[PDB]
Each structure stands twice: as structure tokens, then as C-alpha cells.
Amino acid sequence: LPPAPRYFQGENTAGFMRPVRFEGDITNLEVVGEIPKSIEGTFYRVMPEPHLPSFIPNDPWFNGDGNISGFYFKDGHVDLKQRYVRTEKFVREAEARRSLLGKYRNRYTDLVEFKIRSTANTNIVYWRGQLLALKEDSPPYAMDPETLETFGVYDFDGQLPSLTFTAHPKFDPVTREMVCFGYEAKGDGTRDICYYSFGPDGKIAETVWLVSPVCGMIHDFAVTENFVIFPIIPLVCDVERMKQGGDHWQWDYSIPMYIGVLPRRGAQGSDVKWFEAPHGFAGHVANAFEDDKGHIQLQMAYAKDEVEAHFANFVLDYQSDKLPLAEPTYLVDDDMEFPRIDDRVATRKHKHTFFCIFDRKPGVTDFEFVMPRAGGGAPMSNGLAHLNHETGDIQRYLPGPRKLTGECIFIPRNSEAAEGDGYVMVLLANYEDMCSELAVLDTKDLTNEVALIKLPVRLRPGVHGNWVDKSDVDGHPAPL
Amino acid sequence: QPEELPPAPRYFQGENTAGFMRPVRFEGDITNLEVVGEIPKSIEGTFYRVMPEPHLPSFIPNDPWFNGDGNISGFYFKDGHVDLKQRYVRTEKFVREAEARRSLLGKYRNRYTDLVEFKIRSTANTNIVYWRGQLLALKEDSPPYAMDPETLETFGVYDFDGQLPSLTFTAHPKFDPVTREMVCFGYEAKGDGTRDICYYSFGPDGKIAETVWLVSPVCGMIHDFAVTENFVIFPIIPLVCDVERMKQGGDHWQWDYSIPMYIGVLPRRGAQGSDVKWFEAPHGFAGHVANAFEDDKGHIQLQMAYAKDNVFFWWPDANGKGPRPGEVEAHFANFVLDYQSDKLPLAEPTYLVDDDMEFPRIDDRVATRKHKHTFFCIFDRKPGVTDFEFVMPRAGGGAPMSNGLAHLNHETGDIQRYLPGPRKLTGECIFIPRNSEAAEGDGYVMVLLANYEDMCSELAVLDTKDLTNEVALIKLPVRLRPGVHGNWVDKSDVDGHPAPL
Ligand SMILES: [Cl-]
Ligand SMILES: [Cl-]
Ligand SMILES: [Fe+2]
Ligand SMILES: [Fe+2]
């Protein structure tokens, strides 16, 4: 076997990116200010954090084993629980005490044969009394919301029709359905997309097989009352390249940003229309909804070719036979990503969005101090913004010149709160202290920290996270 | 409000919790620790160490470091790999404060400052030893807390199946490698300010063997003791307890300039309390015992750290006077005691080395018998050895400092010194026999380093053939607060203690 290094080396594991690899508990986290006493629930977030040094030099950040953080809030107190997902990779590498899984999404570089290659390191969502730890090349891993014990790879009682499960399922607040898909749904380099949904009784509802015009990355999707929408990133998979030891993904300058529209209920695969947005990068979906003309308003981060994407509105008409789309309109000027809405209006008209920004205004980030301490290979964000879509008012939270942010969560103030009224939480990297902090903001004034929770350790830059409110028996908020 | 408790802060403040002393308070696992160099693959066992680490901010401003809840680290070694397991002792203090989510226990050894009545006040934060399949987490004002060596689960306060005769159990029991006895005592054994010492021992069958009640000439701190084939020896630190001072909110301990360093000698087997002889060493501070043994004349050679002033300077005299931090040096002293002698005053001890030293360890395979190897912490004040300008603003305020280890060969007089570097400090070391046939003092030394450059802890592995060379440096991703005592439990020892030489 290629030798297993006994310590981490290279930019992906330097400074703030150095793996900690802790599993366990820190109760009674230190707090500056006051956590509102009525907040009750858990903030779950996932970070890639390699458990063992990779035998692959400069293994990318996005290949790291999924480590789940839960912040448990009650009566103005907060406790941390942290545990690795017991993926096949994690379990087999822990038993061997060395790395065995190879390059990102290239099984031809693995030192042993894996059934499931998931690092479960992209998203952590709640479904019917379990957490689902998500990686778009794999089924979910089911976990206990209270103990963070791993139950195992989850196939929804043998109903899962796809080899793959998106990191970005949508929760319909009216129907209580989890709306899902997988791309490369029949394995490496396949153009198969499987669209499927689960009702609140846990039974599969939709299953539709459709065909992508290229084997492209479909990272995120959008759901409206009557449609599901598949934006394709121009990253394209060739299995022949992989068999020679090459990358799963390669950028294709020549192709549009395809946006597939499929009827949400009772469709065949041939019903998909592959609209052609101008060449660019499909970032995260904020939300999509049908307007009173029945046209789809798709709001998502969009880049051409630190966060360098813009908050785009695409207008889609399923009835239109013209496949080429106009350039989108832009809702704000900011370099942005990681958009969140009040999920009580998901798949319907939203008028509040919260997102990460990278403000390049001189002085906002002390780059001279931060860059030599930051390591490499994770998105950077130096603030949050709140857009009111009705008034056009924007509030910006800037944590400080020596701090960066992850993706935020939104918490309704209570079950009677107006859309976008409540609290925002976001994990900060404090490069001064080389510690993580959890900031609690009131949506009445996003510029002010109501509480700053001071972790005694670093949490590596992570990916997605979700709020599970104690008032919601099914873990998801009630519709507005 | 009229009965309102003093407020509990929601974050740590003060020097005792700044920089490297900032509480982490993590419980759980870090497996497969990063290693520079190579851990010798034949090393198999666990290094257990305890640190005081407050779980909740004290209602007392600037609460001393030594008031922190006992947090147990285990470093599990096998086949050149090492895993960390970390867990708090479930003391009454820990459990009740966790349930209230606030501090309730008051000053060090002053129950009159507690916000509620405790049955057991232990923080179990001084030592962690192995006895008959359990860990015992030790604090000299309390019985031990029993813990699982594999999971670090707390079983609870331990009274040795109802046999424990004392309210108190020393942090420094001795393990006789020939008889396999655990030799123990407690001072203040009948409660606050009592002069009662209970000397007791447990055989390898778990049954109590000795129990002797004796009387201290003063209510003085007996932190450590020594055991020979035929004697037990009680050196008293001139820190003295007055209960009347405690009732007014004052310190348990206060320095007494006027008294000798008393050294009590009691026959080890079948004695009455009246058989103790209270020898009078010159006024000074009784530091840790390396080891004691009887020579061929039957005289006791007691080897211990000894200072001429108050090492525990945070407990000063009645006028609040004492030494500054770093002012008092302890030296490696040899006291000669003859139980048959009727002269109570003793000569000044002889000194084995010049170094400012403490935390002496021997090859415990010769404990209570003649030893010819000692490993100890040193504090070298030679300019440049510690970069104080860099370290002091990052160190917070904690235990007196160590910037190296030394190995003394008592036969040859040869000393080797391990200096980890100008921006690193050391804890107490452990000694590991190379194997069951190794000569005395032949094997490995481990020591936890505080690396102030990286603000991380490291575990250094040394071979006794050359103490100056790190064979492996284990790089923890976190800080472990400076701790107190630790012990090696070798996988080759069914009872957790090495076989006699
Ligand atoms: Cl598990
Ligand atoms: Cl326990
Ligand atoms: Fe994503
Ligand atoms: Fe001690």
C-alpha cells in the first residue's frame, strides 16, 4: 500500500483548517450577552474533517469525513455535542488506522473496494425523527438527533430508487413532503436523474426517471407548487478520464447552464424541458415560486466564468417552446452565496432572504492578518445580509476585520411570528483567538450580536446546517 | 433580593483562565493522534493524568487554578498508535453544579464559603492511580473517586467495601512492588483542623491490613509521605490550619515561620500511635518524595524536594507576606533518620544535585527499597533557556513552572537534561520499563509539553539511553491545561503495577 502519513501536511490542513477530530460533549458554553430564553431547539451543522491523513497529497477540503455539531439551546443555556458519521469509509479506515479511500468521487484510486463512498459531509437535515447526513454521490446516513449515534446507510425502508440522494432536499411546509432527487442516479457518469418525494407517512410518492443532456453536476434544485427545476453546473464527468486516475469533474466552457423544468406530480421523464440559461455556474437556490401568470421565479446564486456569485432571478415558462433564456435580473450588488429563506414559505412567494457576502470594501477584512492563518480550500464570507424583497432594504452583519462567517440559519421568533421575524445564528472563525464563536442576531437589527457564544476549540469551516425547533413535532416549522 | 445567591458569571475572567489556562472543558475522544518521529511499537499501556479545569465559572472572582474540577486524560498506546480519552470525575461538586448549571462550592477547603451543604467536597483533581481494576481519582481532603480505566466512567466515592477508616485519603499512596500492598494515610482524618493522622494499607486481596491512629504535633499539611521495608515517614509542610480563621472566611492554610519541618517516623507493621517519633528538620517546605529506603545500618535515607521558604506562596503568613512567583527554589535533599535515636533535631540535609527541581519519579519496581535512578522536573533560570518575554503573557497564572526534565544516576552522579525548547514548559513525567527484564531506570519517559508558540499540548516520548532526544512528539490539536500527577498502567501488568526487581 502507499504509505499513510502520521500527521497532516499542506494548505488544506494549515492554521484554522488544521483538523481537531474531537468527538464528545462540551456543556454550558461561555456566553457574552444573553441568548433569548424562549429559543428552544438544536442547530445542527456538518464539517468535512479528515479523521486520518489522506495517502493522496493535498486531498481537497470537500473529501473530509463528515463531523456533526449539535448546539442544544434551552432557557438561555447551550450545550455542544460533536460526532463523526459512521460511514463505511470512517468505520473501515478507523479499523485499519489509515486512509483507504482515494480521490474525490474516483473509486479507481481506492485502496480497497467500498460499497458506499459517502463522507456524509455536505448537509444534515431532520426527517421523521432521524437526522440524515447527506453527500450527493450516496444515500443518506441516518443518525439519532439526541445522541448523534449513526444508525447506518438509509434506503427509506427499501423505497429509495436511486444510488444517490441530493444534499439539498426541499421541505414543503403545506404538504409536509420531503422533495428529493439524485443525479448520476445509476452510477458513475450516468445521465440518469431520479426525481422522488416522501409523504409525511414516510411512503414514497413521486418517482420519475429523466435524462440530463450531459453528465453534469446538479448540486441544488428548486420546487414550486406545480414544478421541480434542475440547474446544471457546467462540470462534466468522463469515466474514461477517472479510470486513468483523473478528476470526476472537469469544467466545460462550451455549454449553457441547463435548467430542466418537470411537472411536480404525475410526469413522465419525456415531460422535462431543458431550458438554456447563459453559460455560468449554478450556485445555491434561495427559493422558487410560481407568480400569478404561472411563470417560475427561480432565485439563486449565479456566477459567469471568497464568494463571487450574484443573487439572480430567472423567469421560466414551462409552456414556452423557446429553450434559450435571457440573462437573469439581479436582486442585490453583493458578492454572495449560502442563501436562506423563512422555510415556512418554501416553494411559495418569499419576501426575505439571508445570505453570506464577501465585501471587498477596503478595511472590512484584515487580509494581512487573516490569510497567513486561514489555510486553504473553503469558501470565505466576511458578513451576512438580509434583503427585504418588498421594500428593497438591506441590513449587513459584519462580525469584524479578523473574523469570517459560515452559512446562517433562521429561527422564527415563535409560531405566530411574521415571515423573516426572529433570530439568525452563524458560526464565526475568530483568527485573533484561533477559536470558533456562534453569533445570535435579532432580525429587528442584523448589525448587532444579542449573544456571542465562545467555543473553547476550533470548528473547521463547514458546509450546511439546519435549525430543529423543539415546538415542531416533525422538526419543520408550520406554514404561514 | 434578600436570599439571592452571589451571581454566577457566564464566561471565564481573570489571570487563572487567560491564554494557555483558558478552560476547554471537553469530554470525549480524539483517536489516532498526529505523531512526529516514531512511538516504539512495543510500548503498550495507558498514561493517565489529571488536571484541575473548572466546568463552570466560579462565583468567587479569580478563583485559583487548583480549585478546578478534576478532568482525567488517558493516552492509550498500542503498536505505535495513540488515542486520547478525556472525562471529568463525577464528584458531588461536579454533579450538583452541572444540575444547577452554576458554581456552588466556595474556597479551597473552606466549607463555610459553600453556597449549599456538600457531603463530599472533593474536586478529585490531584492524582489518578490504578488499584485492582479501578482508577482512583485523589484529593487529600476526601476519599477517592473510583473510575473505569477503559471508559473513564465514574463509579462513585470509594470506601473500599466499607473498610476506609479515615475521612481523608492522601493524593500520594505508595505501591510496594514486593508485597503488592497499597500503603496510604489521611491527615485531618477526623475533620477540619483535627491533628488526627490515620495510617492504613490494603493487601492485594483488597482487605485492609494496617490501621494506626496517631497525632500530628500541629495541624499541618502532610501532602506526601515515604515508605521503607519497616517504616512509614510523614513530612509536615509548615502550612497550618486554624478553624476559627476559616469560620471568618479565611484560608484553610497559613504559613508558620516559627516551626520546624516535622518528620514523623512510625513502624510500618503492628505499631500503636504513641510509637511515632516526630523528628525536627530545619524550618522549610516538604516537597514531593522521590523514594525512601533503609541502608544496611537500618537508617532511613529519605530523598525528597526541600525548599527553605513557602513554595505555596498563594497561602502566605498572617500578615499576607510570602515569596513572589519564581522566587523559591526546591532542591533534591537526602535526610538521614534513625528511629532508635532520641535526638529529635536533625542536621541540614545533603543535596544530590544543584538544580531547582520537583515532581521526582523513580523506577517504581524498587519503591520502598534502594533506588539509583531519579527523573524530575527542573526550572533552569539561566537567561535564554525559557523565552519569558514570549511565554509569560500567554501562560496565564498556574502551578510553578518546569522548563525541563533531568535523569540522575545516583551511582555514577551523571545527569542528562531534556530541554524541550525556549517556548515550551513540561508537566510531571512518567517512567516506563523497556520490558519485564529491563535494568532499573532502563526504558521510556513521557511528559506533556505546553507549546506556547502553537498554543497546543504535545506528548514527548524519550528513551532513557539519551534523555536529550525526542523519539516521538505527539501533537495534540487542543490545549490540555497544566495538570498535577499522572501514572503509567502497563498492559503487561495484570494488577496495573510493575513486577519487583
Ligand atoms: Cl454510532
Ligand atoms: Cl460517569
Ligand atoms: Fe451545497
Ligand atoms: Fe502532589
Side-chain angles (χ1 to χ4, degrees), chain A residues 1-292 294-480, chain B residues 1-381 383-501:
Chain A
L1 288 189
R6 291 302 298 273
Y7 58 91
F8 293 99
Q9 269 197 307
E11 204 57 34
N12 275 300
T13 58
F16 211 96
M17 295 293 295
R18 189 194 173 191
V20 181
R21 307 184 297 113
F22 154 77
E23 305 196 286
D25 296 286
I26 312 178
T27 66
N28 296 290
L29 298 175
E30 296 179 79
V31 181
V32 179
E34 195 163 344
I35 299 165
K37 285 190 209 320
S38 68
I39 292 172
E40 192 181 2
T42 309
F43 175 29
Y44 299 103
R45 53 89 71 178
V46 55
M47 62 183 162
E49 184 174 48
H51 191 230
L52 288 152
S54 179
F55 67 91
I56 300 301
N58 300 302
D59 198 32
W61 166 77
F62 208 37
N63 222 27
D65 296 297
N67 200 349
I68 308 303
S69 301
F71 297 91
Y72 298 76
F73 290 85
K74 185 171 167 63
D75 294 330
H77 54 247
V78 56
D79 304 323
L80 171 64
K81 188 178 292 284
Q82 185 90 50
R83 205 164 155 83
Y84 275 114
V85 188
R86 262 50 188 183
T87 64
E88 184 181 336
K89 170 188 189 304
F90 182 93
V91 167
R92 290 181 74 178
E93 290 186 342
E95 167 66 4
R97 288 185 180 275
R98 62 152 297 150
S99 50
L100 296 173
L101 188 121
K103 278 178 58 171
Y104 184 77
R105 295 198 69 161
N106 192 344
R107 74 187 70 254
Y108 300 96
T109 64
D110 292 343
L111 299 185
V112 296
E113 182 159 354
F114 286 92
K115 290 316 312 276
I116 304 295
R117 296 186 81 262
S118 191
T119 50
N121 70 357
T122 299
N123 204 354
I124 184 73
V125 300
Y126 188 99
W127 183 241
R128 308 186 78 256
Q130 302 188 115
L131 301 180
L132 301 179
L134 307 184
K135 179 72 161 187
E136 65 202 54
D137 66 352
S138 299
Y141 274 81
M143 306 176 78
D144 191 302
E146 293 319 302
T147 69
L148 298 187
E149 175 206 344
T150 301
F151 298 123
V153 70
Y154 193 56
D155 62 10
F156 297 83
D157 306 298
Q159 293 176 106
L160 180 63
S162 179
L163 295 182
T164 62
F165 186 105
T166 185
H168 293 291
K170 300 296 187 268
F171 300 90
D172 187 318
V174 177
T175 65
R176 318 307 294 181
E177 294 167 308
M178 185 173 61
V179 190
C180 322
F181 76 99
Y183 75 92
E184 293 189 53
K186 293 188 177 180
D188 287 341
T190 58
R191 294 191 299 126
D192 300 289
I193 303 163
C194 190
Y195 161 55
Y196 52 96
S197 67
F198 297 95
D201 65 352
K203 294 310 187 280
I204 199 153
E206 293 293 317
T207 293
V208 187
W209 290 92
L210 55 151
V211 162
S212 193
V214 299
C215 188
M217 184 189 277
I218 316 182
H219 182 63
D220 203 346
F221 87 134
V223 179
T224 71
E225 185 172 307
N226 297 298
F227 297 105
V228 297
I229 300 104
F230 302 103
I232 310 188
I233 300 164
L235 289 166
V236 173
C237 177
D238 181 352
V239 174
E240 293 309 306
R241 176 176 65 242
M242 290 165 65
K243 288 181 182 152
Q244 303 306 309
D247 300 330
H248 190 103
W249 293 125
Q250 186 177 93
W251 187 259
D252 186 337
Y253 296 94
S254 71
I255 60 169
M257 189 181 77
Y258 290 108
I259 307 177
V261 180
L262 184 80
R264 179 165 168 191
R265 297 186 199 282
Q268 314 168 28
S270 57
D271 292 329
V272 69
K273 289 204 191 180
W274 290 110
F275 293 101
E276 297 172 3
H279 178 78
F281 193 98
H284 287 102
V285 172
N287 187 51
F289 63 91
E290 292 158 47
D291 61 24
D292 54 13
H295 299 156
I296 299 160
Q297 308 290 325
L298 169 64
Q299 305 196 334
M300 61 180 301
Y302 175 69
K304 309 302 294 191
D305 282 336
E306 314 156 9
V307 288
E308 52 159 28
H310 302 290
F311 194 14
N313 188 81
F314 290 92
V315 181
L316 309 157
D317 179 10
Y318 181 72
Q319 305 306 322
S320 179
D321 285 329
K322 200 192 178 171
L323 294 182
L325 299 175
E327 292 291 343
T329 58
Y330 292 103
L331 299 172
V332 298
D333 289 332
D334 301 58
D335 295 341
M336 55 79 67
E337 246 288 356
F338 296 104
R340 309 302 300 266
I341 64 158
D342 187 334
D343 280 335
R344 295 181 291 165
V345 297
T347 81
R348 301 223 182 288
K349 193 188 201 59
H350 68 289
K351 60 182 187 183
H352 296 277
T353 312
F354 308 92
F355 49 90
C356 293
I357 60 174
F358 200 77
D359 190 350
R360 321 267 172 154
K361 181 145 292 213
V364 171
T365 297
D366 183 359
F367 291 111
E368 195 199 346
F369 188 89
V370 171
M371 288 315 89
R373 291 173 172 75
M380 290 187 158
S381 163
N382 60 7
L384 299 179
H386 170 217
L387 172 61
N388 182 318
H389 295 234
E390 277 199 0
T391 62
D393 294 333
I394 310 171
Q395 293 210 299
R396 292 185 181 84
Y397 170 63
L398 299 180
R402 297 186 168 179
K403 301 194 196 191
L404 298 180
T405 81
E407 176 198 64
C408 77
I409 51 152
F410 169 75
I411 305 167
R413 191 175 308 282
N414 52 54
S415 64
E416 264 88 89
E419 191 193 329
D421 181 54
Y423 312 101
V424 170
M425 296 192 182
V426 65
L427 200 69
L428 305 183
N430 187 341
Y431 293 92
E432 192 97 68
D433 296 344
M434 298 298 291
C435 289
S436 294
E437 303 166 343
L438 183 58
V440 180
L441 317 181
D442 195 306
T443 59
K444 287 203 299 297
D445 179 10
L446 204 74
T447 75
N448 190 51
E449 292 151 358
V450 167
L452 189 60
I453 302 156
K454 316 276 266 172
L455 282 70
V457 299
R458 286 178 295 103
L459 297 188
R460 269 191 143 213
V463 201
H464 298 285
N466 291 282
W467 183 252
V468 181
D469 202 278
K470 213 66 193 150
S471 74
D472 299 323
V473 61
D474 77 0
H476 292 272
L480 281 182
Chain B
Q1 276 194 296
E3 290 172 65
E4 194 157 320
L5 289 189
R10 290 300 297 273
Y11 59 91
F12 293 98
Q13 267 200 305
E15 201 195 2
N16 282 290
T17 59
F20 212 96
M21 294 298 290
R22 189 200 171 185
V24 181
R25 307 182 298 110
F26 96 77
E27 301 193 288
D29 296 286
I30 312 181
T31 65
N32 296 290
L33 296 175
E34 296 182 80
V35 180
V36 179
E38 195 177 8
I39 300 165
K41 288 161 66 48
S42 66
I43 292 173
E44 192 180 358
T46 308
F47 175 31
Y48 298 104
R49 51 88 71 180
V50 56
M51 61 182 164
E53 185 178 45
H55 190 231
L56 290 155
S58 179
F59 66 93
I60 297 164
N62 300 302
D63 199 32
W65 75 278
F66 51 74
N67 284 342
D69 295 296
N71 200 350
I72 308 304
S73 300
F75 295 92
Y76 297 76
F77 289 85
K78 185 172 191 197
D79 290 323
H81 301 279
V82 57
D83 304 323
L84 171 63
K85 188 178 292 285
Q86 185 92 240
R87 203 165 156 82
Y88 276 114
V89 187
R90 261 51 186 183
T91 63
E92 184 180 334
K93 170 189 190 302
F94 182 94
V95 167
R96 289 180 74 179
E97 290 186 343
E99 169 66 3
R101 288 188 182 274
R102 62 151 298 151
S103 51
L104 297 173
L105 188 119
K107 284 175 60 164
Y108 186 80
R109 295 199 69 160
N110 193 342
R111 74 189 67 256
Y112 301 96
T113 64
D114 293 342
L115 299 184
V116 295
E117 184 156 39
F118 286 92
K119 297 211 315 273
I120 305 295
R121 295 186 80 262
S122 192
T123 49
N125 70 355
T126 298
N127 204 353
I128 184 73
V129 301
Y130 187 100
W131 183 241
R132 308 186 79 254
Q134 302 189 114
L135 300 180
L136 302 178
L138 306 186
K139 179 128 206 281
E140 66 201 54
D141 66 352
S142 300
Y145 276 80
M147 309 175 76
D148 191 303
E150 321 181 301
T151 68
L152 297 188
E153 170 188 342
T154 300
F155 298 123
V157 67
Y158 192 57
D159 62 10
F160 297 83
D161 305 296
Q163 295 175 105
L164 179 64
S166 179
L167 292 180
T168 61
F169 186 105
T170 183
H172 292 291
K174 299 298 187 267
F175 298 91
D176 187 318
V178 175
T179 65
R180 318 306 294 181
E181 295 166 307
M182 185 172 62
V183 189
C184 322
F185 75 99
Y187 75 92
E188 293 189 52
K190 291 189 153 165
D192 284 345
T194 59
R195 292 189 302 124
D196 304 287
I197 301 163
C198 190
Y199 160 57
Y200 51 99
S201 67
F202 297 96
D205 66 351
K207 293 312 209 232
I208 198 151
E210 292 293 317
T211 293
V212 187
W213 290 92
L214 56 151
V215 163
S216 194
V218 299
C219 188
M221 185 190 273
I222 316 181
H223 181 63
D224 204 346
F225 88 135
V227 179
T228 71
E229 185 172 308
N230 298 298
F231 297 105
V232 296
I233 299 103
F234 302 104
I236 310 188
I237 301 165
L239 289 166
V240 173
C241 178
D242 181 348
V243 170
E244 292 307 306
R245 175 177 66 242
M246 292 170 62
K247 290 179 173 162
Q248 303 173 318
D251 294 344
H252 189 104
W253 294 126
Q254 184 175 97
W255 186 259
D256 186 337
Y257 74 93
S258 70
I259 60 167
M261 189 181 77
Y262 291 109
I263 308 179
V265 180
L266 183 79
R268 179 164 169 193
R269 297 192 199 282
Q272 304 170 327
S274 57
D275 292 329
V276 69
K277 290 205 189 179
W278 289 111
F279 293 100
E280 298 172 359
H283 179 73
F285 190 98
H288 287 103
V289 171
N291 188 51
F293 63 91
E294 291 160 50
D295 61 24
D296 54 13
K297 329 223 162 184
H299 299 157
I300 300 159
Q301 309 289 327
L302 170 64
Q303 304 197 335
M304 60 181 303
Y306 174 70
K308 303 305 297 192
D309 209 347
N310 186 7
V311 170
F312 297 170
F313 60 81
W314 53 87
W315 298 318
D317 79 14
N319 295 337
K321 309 306 192 218
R324 305 198 151 287
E327 177 182 341
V328 175
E329 300 193 9
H331 303 290
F332 195 11
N334 188 82
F335 290 92
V336 182
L337 308 156
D338 178 10
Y339 182 71
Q340 305 306 321
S341 178
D342 286 328
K343 201 191 192 212
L344 293 183
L346 299 175
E348 292 292 342
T350 57
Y351 292 104
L352 298 174
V353 300
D354 283 332
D355 300 56
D356 182 12
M357 55 80 66
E358 246 291 352
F359 295 104
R361 308 303 300 264
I362 63 157
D363 187 334
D364 279 336
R365 295 181 291 165
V366 296
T368 81
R369 293 197 283 116
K370 194 198 222 311
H371 68 288
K372 58 184 188 190
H373 297 278
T374 311
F375 308 92
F376 50 90
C377 292
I378 60 173
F379 189 51
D380 189 351
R381 271 179 201 68
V385 171
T386 297
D387 183 359
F388 289 112
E389 193 155 317
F390 187 89
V391 169
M392 287 323 282
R394 291 173 173 75
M401 292 185 163
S402 167
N403 60 6
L405 299 180
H407 169 216
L408 171 62
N409 181 318
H410 295 234
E411 278 196 347
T412 62
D414 295 335
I415 311 168
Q416 293 205 299
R417 291 183 183 84
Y418 168 63
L419 281 292
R423 297 185 169 178
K424 301 190 194 196
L425 299 179
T426 81
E428 179 196 62
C429 76
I430 51 154
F431 170 74
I432 305 167
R434 192 176 307 281
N435 52 57
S436 64
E437 284 145 275
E440 190 192 329
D442 182 54
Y444 311 103
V445 170
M446 296 191 182
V447 64
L448 199 69
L449 305 182
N451 185 342
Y452 293 92
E453 281 236 81
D454 296 344
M455 297 299 289
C456 286
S457 294
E458 304 169 339
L459 181 59
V461 180
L462 317 180
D463 192 310
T464 58
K465 286 204 298 297
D466 179 8
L467 207 73
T468 74
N469 189 53
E470 293 157 347
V471 171
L473 188 59
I474 301 155
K475 313 278 270 177
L476 282 67
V478 298
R479 292 174 293 99
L480 299 189
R481 270 190 147 208
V484 198
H485 298 286
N487 290 283
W488 181 252
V489 181
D490 202 278
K491 261 299 156 214
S492 75
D493 299 323
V494 184
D495 79 357
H497 292 273
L501 282 186

